[PDB]
Amino acid sequence: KMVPPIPPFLGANHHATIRQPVAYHVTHSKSDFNTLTYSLLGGYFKFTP
Amino acid sequence: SNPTTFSVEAIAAYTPVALIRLLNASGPLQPGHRVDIADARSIYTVGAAASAARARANHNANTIRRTAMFAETDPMTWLRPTVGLRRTFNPRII
């Protein structure tokens, strides 16, 4: 109930692409259903230089 | 059915009680006689439930046999998973 069970044969959190803060964003934001989708897309932008 | 013989209430009365839709209680009573009674009450309902379950008797040419309702063994389960009915249909078979 407090830790998301993701098995180590399917990639762990600190090595995967989508991590815990995006999940915490999607489960604890109550704004709308359109601006939530656009905010989630605003999440998915690389931080490469 | 004989000899006890009929429930007139009285006290005994006779535990089956194989009548259908009896308006015998009201009916006359009229009223019950001068006996102490304790059961009376229990043996009446035990007989009444039997005289509805046995009063079913027919209507089974209209069923549509009862089933497992939920999911349970069904002692094989190794080549066919089990699912029961939700009894929402009309059992009449015509």
Next chain:
Amino acid sequence: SNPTTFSVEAIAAYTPVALIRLLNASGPLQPGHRVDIADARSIYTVGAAASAARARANHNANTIRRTAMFAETDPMTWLRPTVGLRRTFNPRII
């Protein structure tokens, strides 16, 4: 079909399995005997599918044969384009 003799489950069992709408499985078993078993499972499945494809048998007097589905050759295609039926109609021929 004969002589093998009839699937009594057991694990032999007999590979087709040429029955229709069987209330044989559930049904009594009750349960399976003292054997080794693993398969069973596959031999039952390939037999059951074949005993439904054969259990079609009729209903092809109601077809309305299957068609080209999608757009594909149709070994000329040099005097006529090819377009298949998207099956949303009711095939019954009556």
Next chain:
Amino acid sequence: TQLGLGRHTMTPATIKAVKDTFEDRAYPTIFYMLEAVIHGNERNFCALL
């Protein structure tokens, strides 16, 4: 009010219906009898669907 900012709220239709059925005084006793007899058994409920 402070706790319930973005959390789930009930539509006014079900609020009106539920308030009417707690404020109904002509509620039949058949419902009380059936609720007292089947008494929260899944086998008893699903046999009387």
